[PDB]
C-alpha cells in the first residue's frame, strides 16, 4: 500500500510524500526476507532514488547509497545505473546522462514510471546544462553552444527561446549571426513598489478621512 501510494504520488510530481512512502516500504521489505522480498526492496530502492533526484539533494542520494546494509546486499547494477544518473545530474552534463541511460537502459526503461519520469528529467538536465555552459559568457556563439551540448542549431535555438521566455537566464537571443548576449538580472528596486503601495493606502485614507468630514459639512 505504501509503495503504490508513492507510485501514484510520483505521478503528481510531489516527491517528499513519495519519498516517505518509499522509505517506509523499503524498511518494511528489508525487515522480512522471503523469495520476493529482495525484488521488492530493489524496486522500492529504485523508486525512492528516482523520487529524490528531481528535487536535487544529491548529497542525500550519496548518503543513502553509502548506507551500510543498503549497499551490502541490496546493492545491484540497477542501483549503480540510478546512481550514475544521479551523478550525471550533479555534474549537469546532458552527454553523461545520455551515456548512462544508453549504457544502463535495461535497468531504466523498465518500471514504466521510471522512463516516463526520465523524459522530464532529460528536459530538466538539458535546461541545466544550457545554463551551465552559458554562465562564463557574454556573447557566446550558437554554433559553439551546439557543439558543446551536441544538439542541433534549430533545437538549441528553440530551447533557448523557451528558457528565456520562462526567465531562467536573463540573456537576449539575437539573429545577427548566432549571438546569445547574456545580461545580468534586472534590479526592480523595492523602494518604488513600497512607495506605490503607500500611495494607494494614503489615497484610501484620504477618502475615508473626507467621509469622516461629512458630519462637519
Amino acid at each position: 500500500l505504501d509503495l503504490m501510494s508513492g507510485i501514484l504520488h510520483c505521478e503528481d510530481k510531489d516527491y517528499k510524500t513519495a519519498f516517505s512512502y518509499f522509505f517506509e516500504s523499503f524498511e518494511s521489505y528489508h525487515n522480512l526476507t522471503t523469495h520476493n522480498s529482495y525484488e521488492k526492496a530493489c524496486q522500492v530502492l529504485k523508486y525512492m532514488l528516482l523520487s529524490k533526484i528531481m528535487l536535487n539533494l544529491i548529497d542525500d542520494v550519496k548518503n543513502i547509497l553509502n548506507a551500510k546494509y543498503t549497499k551490502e546486499t541490496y546493492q545491484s547494477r540497477g542501483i549503480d545505473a540510478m546512481k550514475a544518473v544521479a551523478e550525471a545530474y550533479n555534474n549537469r552534463s546532458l552527454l553523461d546522462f545520455n551515456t548512462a541511460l544508453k549504457q544502463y537502459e535495461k535497468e531504466l526503461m523498465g518500471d514504466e514510471l521510471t522512463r516516463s519520469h526520465f523524459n522530464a528529467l532529460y528536459d530538466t538536465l538539458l535546461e541545466s546544462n544550457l545554463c551551465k555552459i552559458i554562465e562564463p559568457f557574454e556573447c557566446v556563439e550558437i554554433s559553439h553552444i551546439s557543439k558543446i551540448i551536441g544538439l542541433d542549431t534549430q533545437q538549441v535555438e528553440g530551447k533557448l527561446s523557451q528558457m528565456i521566455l520562462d526567465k531562467i537566464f536573463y540573456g537576449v537571443l539575437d539573429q545577427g549571426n548566432g549571438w546569445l548576449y547574456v545580461y545580468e538580472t534586472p534590479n526592480q528596486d523595492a523602494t518604488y513598489d513600497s512607495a506605490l503601495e503607500l500611495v494607494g493606502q494614503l489615497n484610501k485614507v484620504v477618502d475615508q478621512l473626507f467621509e469622516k468630514a461629512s458630519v462637519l459639512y
Binding site: 528596486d189 523602494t191 518604488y192 512607495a195 503607500l198 500611495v199 494614503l202 485614507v205 484620504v206 478621512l209 469622516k212 468630514a213 458630519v215 462637519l216
Partner: protein, 292 residues
C-alpha cells in the same frame, strides 16, 4: 610596553579642577600650572577621572631649572588610594596654552610613579580655543622625520570629553541656563554640520599659513608633512564622471523618499485638522444648547 594611546576620555571634573587650580594660585601670564591626572588605564581608551594640585615651579629661564616636589606625588597617592583604590596615576597635565620645551624632560620624572606611558593633557585654561581645549600627547620613540637619530617625542591622540553618571548630573545642572534643551533634532544636526565646516576652514587656513611660513624658510623642511599633504591631494576625489552619475541617482532616490514622507506628514495634518474642527463644532453646540 602598552600601546594604549588610541582614545582619551576626560571627565569634566579633571578639567574644572584644572581651571580652579589656575584661578587659585593666581598664575599670571607665562606661568604654567601643572597637576596629576588620576584615572584608570591598561585598556585601549585611556580615561581620566580625577586630578589634584601640584607644587610645580619654574623660572622663565634655562629650561632645566624646573622644580617639582617628589614627595607630594606619593603623599597624594596614599590619601587618594585610601579614598578610592580604583584611581591610579596615569600621568600629568599642564595649564596650557601650548607645548613647552621641558614637556619631554619632565615627563620622564613621572615615569616611575606611572605604570604605563605617562599621559600629557594640555588644558586651554584661559580659553583662546574654539574646539575642545584638551589634547593628549603620549611620549613615544620614533625615527626622526629628517632621517636622523630616532627621537622620543609626543604624539597627538584624539581626545573626547565624556562624562559618567556621577558627573553628567552635575554638568547638566550647572549649565541649565544656556543649553537649548528644546533645540530640535534636525536643527541641531545642521548646526553641527555648519560647525564642522567652519572647523575645516580654520584647519585649512592654519595649514596654508604654515606653508607660507615654510616657503620663507622661517621653519625647516619636514618631508613627512609634505608627504601627508601630497597624499591629501591625491585622495581628493574628482567630481566636476561615473561617481557623479551614481551620486545623482542616489540623490534622486533619496529625494523621492523625502517626497513620500512629506506626503504622509501632510495627510496626518489633514486628519488633525478634521478632528480639531469636529471637536470645535461639538464645543460650540455644547455651549449653545447649554446656555439656552
Amino acid at each position: 610596553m602598552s600601546l594604549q594611546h588610541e582614545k582619551v576620555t576626560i571627565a569634566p571634573l579633571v578639567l574644572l579642577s584644572a581651571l580652579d587650580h589656575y584661578e587659585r594660585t593666581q598664575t599670571k601670564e607665562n606661568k604654567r600650572c601643572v597637576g596629576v591626572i588620576l584615572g584608570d588605564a591598561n585598556s585601549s581608551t585611556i580615561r581620566v577621572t580625577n586630578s589634584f594640585a601640584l607644587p610645580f615651579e619654574e623660572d622663565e629661564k634655562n629650561s632645566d631649572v624646573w622644580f617639582l616636589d617628589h614627595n607630594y606625588i606619593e603623599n597624594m597617592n596614599e590619601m587618594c588610594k585610601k579614598i578610592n583604590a580604583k584611581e591610579k596615576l596615569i600621568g600629568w597635565y599642564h595649564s596650557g596654552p601650548k607645548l613647552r620645551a621641558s614637556d619631554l624632560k619632565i615627563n620622564e620624572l613621572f615615569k616611575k610613579y606611572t605604570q604605563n606611558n605617562p599621559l600629557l593633557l594640555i588644558v586651554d585654561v584661559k580659553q583662546q580655543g574654539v574646539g575642545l581645549p584638551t589634547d593628549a600627547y603620549v611620549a613615544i620613540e620614533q625615527v626622526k622625520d629628517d632621517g636622523t637619530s630616532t627621537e622620543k617625542t609626543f604624539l597627538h591622540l584624539p581626545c573626547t570629553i565624556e562624562a559618567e553618571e556621577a558627573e553628567e548630573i552635575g554638568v547638566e545642572h550647572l549649565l541649565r541656563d544656556v543649553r537649548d534643551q528644546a533645540a530640535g533634532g534636525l536643527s541641531i544636526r545642521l548646526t553641527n554640520q555648519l560647525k564642522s565646516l567652519k572647523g575645516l576652514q580654520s584647519k585649512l587656513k592654519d595649514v596654508v599659513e604654515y606653508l607660507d611660513k615654510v616657503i620663507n624658510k622661517e621653519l625647516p623642511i619636514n618631508h613627512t608633512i609634505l608627504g601627508k599633504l601630497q597624499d591629501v591631494f591625491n585622495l581628493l576625489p574628482n567630481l566636476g564622471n561615473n561617481l557623479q552619475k551614481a551620486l545623482t541617482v542616489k540623490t534622486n532616490d533619496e529625494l523621492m523618499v523625502i517626497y513620500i514622507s512629506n506626503l504622509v506628514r501632510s495627510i496626518i495634518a489633514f486628519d488633525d485638522l478634521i478632528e480639531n474642527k469636529i471637536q470645535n463644532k461639538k464645543i460650540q453646540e455644547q455651549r449653545v444648547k447649554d446656555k439656552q
